[PDB]
Amino acid sequence: DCFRIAMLLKELYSKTMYTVEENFKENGLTHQQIIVIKLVAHNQELTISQLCDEMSLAKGTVSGIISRLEQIGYIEKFKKSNDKRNTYVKFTTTGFEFATNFKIKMQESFDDIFKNCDENELSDLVKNLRNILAKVK
């Protein structure tokens, strides 16, 4: 019933993330890491808490993704003096360089899957998703 829906969501999502893993394997970056880079590029900086909500992951998972991305030197963690509560992430110079150079390829990587669709279907899908998500609470 609603089990089928969970499975289809998973299937469509994974197909997306698989083409992204494939396109950046060469660069030594996971699809999760590409996600963060995209989100940091778009926002400049984000709290761990915001990354959790953008990626729909638990704080534990996010903290690991960030530490491994920091170890590769693409992002840095920091705390603003006016806020002892949150930790923040932003790019390093290497990260900025990455996100500039691969803006298109990143954008293309997420798009590849939906080449054959018309905005007809996609708009339909997005409306359904937003409708349903809106009613989850």
Next chain:
Amino acid sequence: YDCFRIAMLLKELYSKTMYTVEENFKENGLTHQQIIVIKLVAHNQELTISQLCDEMSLAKGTVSGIISRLEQIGYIEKFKKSNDKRNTYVKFTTTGFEFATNFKIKMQESFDDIFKNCDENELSDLVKNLRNILAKVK
């Protein structure tokens, strides 16, 4: 909407479903991945490792991991058929079948739950839209 934001919506909705499932079965120390396997085996009776990968959209080594734990907890038996050189099958043990029976209802309601304030028609078009998009994907 770029495609990035669709992916993130798909994930958001998936992740809510799975969080509820984990919560409903945390008492039994069963993960949501395990519940997914148990549901699939209960409907199908027997499944190959390839079929489960395809149904769950996971890599083989991931599925082998989940199955190994269900084996360790005694709910699943993994086996070959003499006639089949290619595949590896899984099915319930007596204990697994018993858990599947006594919690069939609780499993269906763990998935159904977060979609309660939704008309059968809202759910129904989602499903046609996903399937149609998936068909176009290849």
